[PDB]
Scaffold this active site. Structure first.
Site, PDB file in Angstrom:
ATOM      1  CG  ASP A 183     -13.331  22.828   0.718  1.00 48.36           C
ATOM      2  OD1 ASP A 183     -14.300  23.470   0.754  1.00 48.36           O
ATOM      3  OD2 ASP A 183     -12.253  22.934   0.122  1.00 48.36           O
ATOM      4  N   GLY A 195      -7.089  30.655  -6.548  1.00 46.78           N
ATOM      5  CA  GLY A 195      -8.300  31.469  -6.786  1.00 46.78           C
ATOM      6  C   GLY A 195      -9.225  30.741  -7.956  1.00 46.78           C
ATOM      7  CB  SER A 217     -10.696  27.694  -4.253  1.00 45.41           C
ATOM      8  OG  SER A 217      -9.365  27.444  -3.913  1.00 45.41           O
TER       9      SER A 217
END
Ligand SMILES: NC[C@H]1CC[C@@H](C(=O)O)CC1
Length: 251
Positions: free
Chosen positions: A102, A201, A203
């Site tokens: 990620d 938020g 992230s």
């Protein structure tokens, strides 16, 4: 440029996190909303999480800001950019709870055709050297425009930061924690009494650690179950294990 020089926590100005990038999407209706965080790793590159862009991967749709401490207002010295190239990790996966690989790269180019320039509000974050992380139990900082409590509807208007501590794989891979969901290419971090953490938020934002007097981008906000939940820490993309992937795209 000289590199490396929310539940709970505190409000802050971008001078305290000058590497922080605020990423926005322009949509299909002309309206612009906050997508997530990022970190400036070199004048032309901002690093974030793939999960932030996996549903809208068209580069043309994103706006990047540097030197921004406020969500929906202007801050003196802020620099706006277009995403010249949006690189998502082809091995990204989120089939289960954990998000794998990620990490995302954004090449930035202002309307003036320029890359980021150093100032008191715009600075780079040091990338770690291969596999070199701080010791388990080290205090690192997290930053974002994310929710102040998971039940909140709105996002705070001012940038926030807090301190979290690195948790070992042994502890994080426990079954009451995340079990086999956390891999070796991930880093777990939390407040010892579960009172502070990154939330929705936050992230793509950074997990910033001090190693050899350099603020290092040790993690990227990735995933977790809820925010500031007992035994449920924030899980971060372990940057020190993605250096050939970063180098491969910034060459
Ligand atoms: N506490 C880390 C974790 C990172 C973002 C996540 C999400 O966006 O769902 C919620 C919390």
């Amino acid at each position: 440029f000289q590199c490396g020089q929310i539940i709970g926590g505190e409000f802050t100005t971008i001078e305290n996190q000058p590497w922080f990038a605020a990423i926005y999407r322009r949509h299909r209706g002309g309206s612009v909303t906050y997508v997530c965080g990022g970190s400036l790793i070199s004048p032309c590159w901002v690093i974030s999480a793939t999960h932030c862009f996996i549903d809208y991967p068209k580069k043309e749709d994103y706006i990047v800001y540097l030197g921004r401490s406020r969500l929906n207002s202007n801050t003196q010295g802020e620099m706006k950019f277009e995403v010249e190239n949006l690189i998502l990790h082809k091995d990204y996966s989120a089939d289960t709870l954990a998000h794998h690989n990620d990490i995302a790269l954004l090449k930035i180019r202002s309307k003036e055709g320029r890359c980021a320039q150093p100032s008191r509000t715009i600075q780079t974050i040091c990338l770690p050297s291969m596999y070199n992380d701080p010791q388990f139990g080290t205090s690192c900082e997290i930053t974002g425009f994310g929710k102040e409590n998971s039940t909140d509807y709105l996002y705070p208007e001012q940038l926030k930061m807090t301190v979290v501590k690195l948790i070992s794989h042994r502890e994080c891979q426990q079954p009451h924690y995340y079990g086999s969901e956390v891999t070796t290419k991930m880093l777990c971090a939390a407040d010892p009494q579960w009172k502070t953490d990154s939330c929705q938020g936050d992230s793509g934002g950074p997990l910033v650690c001090s190693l050899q007097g350099r603020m290092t981008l040790t993690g990227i906000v990735s995933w977790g179950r809820g925010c500031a939940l007992k035994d449920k820490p924030g899980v971060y993309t372990r940057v020190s294990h993605f250096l050939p992937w970063i180098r491969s795209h910034t060459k």
